[PDB]
Amino acid sequence: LGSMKTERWVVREHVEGVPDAARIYEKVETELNTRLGEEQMLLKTLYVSVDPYLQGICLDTPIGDHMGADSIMQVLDAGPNAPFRPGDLVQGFGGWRTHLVSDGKPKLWQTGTFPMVFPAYRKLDLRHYDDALPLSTALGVMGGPGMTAWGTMTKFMQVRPGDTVVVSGASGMIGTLVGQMAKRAGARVVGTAGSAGKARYLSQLGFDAVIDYKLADDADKMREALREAAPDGVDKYFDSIGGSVTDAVFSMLNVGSQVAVCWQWATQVQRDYHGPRLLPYIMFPRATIRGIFSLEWFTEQNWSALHEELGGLVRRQELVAHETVQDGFEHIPAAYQTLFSASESNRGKVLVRV
C-alpha cells in the first residue's frame, strides 16, 4: 500500500557516565513500510520526553537501534483489529522517531539490565485537557512522572503533620511534586538543588530548606547541611540521587522512617559504585526502604484516580506542575543533554514538541 520517509535518532555509540549526546546519537532518515498488519497502527509522534533514566536504557540499546522514550503519538492509520483508531491520541514508549508502526501491545525490553516490560499504549481523551492541564501533561504530571510521585505518596509513604521530609534531586517535576504533596500533609520539606535560581524556585513552591548539592559535595558537608535543615531528624526520604547525600540521610533516620528509592544518579551516572554499608543504620530506627518502579501502577483505575486527585489541584495552580517544552525533532539530543549539563534554566518536566 506504500511507504513514508521518517527520521529517527539511533544509538551510534555507547559512552559511560554523563552522556555526550552529540557523540552518542545520530539522526537518520528511515523509509518505513506503511502496509499494516491486522492489529498494527501507523503513528505520528507529537511529543517525546527526555529523562535521566534514558542514560541506562541507551547503554542497553544495541548499536543502530532507535532511542526508546516515552512519547505522545497520533494514530495515522490502523489495521481492522487495531487497539486504536485513526485520529486517536495515545501515550506509550514510542521513542525518538518521527513516525513508527506498532500494535501497541506490551513489549519485553529484551536487552535490558532488568527484564522490564513496556506497557500497552494508553488512549488519551482530549476532553481531560485544557490550557491549565494541556495534552503534554500526559508525559508529566498526568503521565509517568506524576504517577511516580503520586503513587509513592499515596501507596507507600504516609506523611504526617510534623514529619521532616527530605527530597534528593528535588528540582525536577517528580521531586517538586513529592515536596508539595508532603507540605500539604503538614510536613517540613527539605530538598537539594543545583543553583541559587532553582533553590528560590523550590522555596516559592513550599520547600522549607534547599541544600546546594554542588557545594555540599561530601557526606560530611551533606551531614552538616542536613543537621541545619532537618534539626529533628529525617522521617521520610524520597531519594533520586544516592551516593553521599543518601549516606548522610541514613545517619539521621528517625524511628519509623520511610525511604523511597526512585533513582540513584550518583551510581548510574557518576559511577559511584562503592561506599559505606547502609543497612547497619536501619535497625534501631526500624526504617522501611522501598524501591520504586512506577510501571507497576500503570492501571486504568490508577490513571482515573491520578486525574481525579491531581488534576483539580493542578489546574488551579495550587499544586504546581511546570514544563519546559523545546521545539523541534532535531533538538531532542540537545534537550536531553541539558538534564546533565545545563539544567539551570529548566523548570518542571522537560519535553520536546515534534
Ligand X SMILES: NC(=O)c1ccc[n+]([C@@H]2O[C@H](COP(=O)([O-])OP(=O)(O)OC[C@H]3O[C@@H](n4cnc5c(N)ncnc54)[C@H](OP(=O)(O)O)[C@@H]3O)[C@@H](O)[C@H]2O)c1
Number of residues that bind its own copies (CB under 8 A): 35
Q: CB-based contacts of 100: which residues, under 8 Å, 6+ apart? A: 6, 32, 42, 43, 45, 73, 94
Question: Would you state the torsion angle of the CA atoms of residues 164, 268, 283, 286, taken in this order, to the nearest 10 degrees?
Answer: 40
Closest to ligand X by CB, 91 vs 98, is 91
User: Is residue 231 at the binding interface for its own copies, with CB under 8 A as the rule?
Assistant: no
246 binds, among ligand X, ligand A1EDK, its own copies, none (CB under 5 to 8 A by kind): its own copies
Of the residues 27, 32, 112, 208, which one makes contact with ligand A1EDK according to CB under 6 A: 112
Q: Is 172 annotated as contributing to ligand binding?
A: yes
Closest to ligand X by CB, 44 vs 322, is 322
Site for ligand A1EDK in 133-162 (CB under 6 A): 144, 148
Residue nearest to ligand A1EDK (CB): 144
Could you tell me the CA-to-CA distances from 176 to 12, 116, 235, 314 in Å, in that order? 34, 26, 18, 13
Rounded Cα–Cα distance for residues 222 and 243 (Å)? 11
Q: Which stretch binds ligand X (CB under 6 A): 13-21, 37-45, 57-65, 187-195?
A: 187-195
Rounded Cα–Cα distance for residues 87 and 74 (Å)? 6
CA-based angle 75:81:86, to the nearest 5?
20
Of the residues 94, 104, 144, 146, which one makes contact with ligand X according to CB under 6 A: 144
Site for ligand X in 278-307 (CB under 6 A): 283, 292-294
Residue with cell 509522534: 45
User: Is residue 268 at the binding interface for ligand A1EDK, with CB under 6 A as the rule?
Assistant: yes
CB of 302 to its own copies, least distance (A): 15
Of the residues 80, 87, 161, 280, which one makes contact with its own copies according to CB under 8 A: 280
98 binds, among its own copies, ligand X, ligand A1EDK, none (CB under 5 to 8 A by kind): none
- Cα–Cα nearest to 62, from 110, 131, 1: 110
Q: Find out whether 13 and 23 touch, Cβ atoms under 8 Å.
A: yes
Q: Is 129 annotated as contributing to ligand binding?
A: no
CB of 29 to ligand A1EDK, least distance (A): 26
Rounded Cα–Cα distance for residues 269 and 345 (Å)? 21
Instruction: Characterize 53-89 residue by residue with b for buried, 16 or more Cβ atoms within 10 angstroms of its Cβ, and e for exposed.
Output: ebbebbbebeeeebbbbbbbbbbbbbbeebbbeeebb
Please state at what angle helix 144-155 crosses helix 173-184, rounded to 10 degrees. 30
Rounded Cα–Cα distance for residues 254 and 235 (Å)? 5
Partners of residue 31 on adjacent β-strands? 5
Of the residues 83, 145, 233, 285, which one makes contact with its own copies according to CB under 8 A: 285
CB of 272 to its own copies, least distance (A): 7
Binding residue positions for NADP(+):
53, 171-175, 194, 198, 213, 262, 270, 292, 294, 343
The footprint of ligand A1EDK (CB under 6 A) covers 53, 56-57, 60, 70, 92-93, 112-114, 116, 118-119, 144, 148, 268, 280, 283-284, 293-295
Residues that bind its own copies (CB under 8 A): 113-114, 116, 239, 242-243, 246, 261-264, 267-268, 272-280, 282-293, 296
